[PDB]
């Protein structure tokens, strides 16, 4: 039994954002003209920064810090 620490909990949400980017990059390649594509054209980051924002913003693991006393925090 292991515990996914904070660094990995971020890593997993980064992986998800890069995977949905992989699909868009794939479809973007086909309908785009050959020689008309650059690393910028194939990449829309919307999923990646949305994965980071959604995790910090919504995820159960990201919690409002309880600060009533320094021992609680």
């Amino acid at each position: 039994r292991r515990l996914r620490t904070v660094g990995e909990l971020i890593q997993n949400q980064i992986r998800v954002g890069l995977s949905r980017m992989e699909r868009v990059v794939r479809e973007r390649m086909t309908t785009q003209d050959v020689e008309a594509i650059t690393p910028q054209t194939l990449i829309n980051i919307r999923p990646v920064v949305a994965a980071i924002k959604e995790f910090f913003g919504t995820s159960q693991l990201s919690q409002f810090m309880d600060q009533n006393n320094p021992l609680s925090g």
């Binding site: 050959v34 650059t38 690393p39 910028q40 990646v48 920064v49």
Partner: peptide
């Protein structure tokens, strides 16, 4: 620091990509 290579024409296209904050 990404890169896109075309095997047909062998061209190299390097670029700088901003992921986000």
């Amino acid at each position: 620091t990404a890169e896109f290579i075309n095997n047909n024409t062998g061209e190299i296209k390097s670029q700088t990509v901003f992921m986000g904050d």
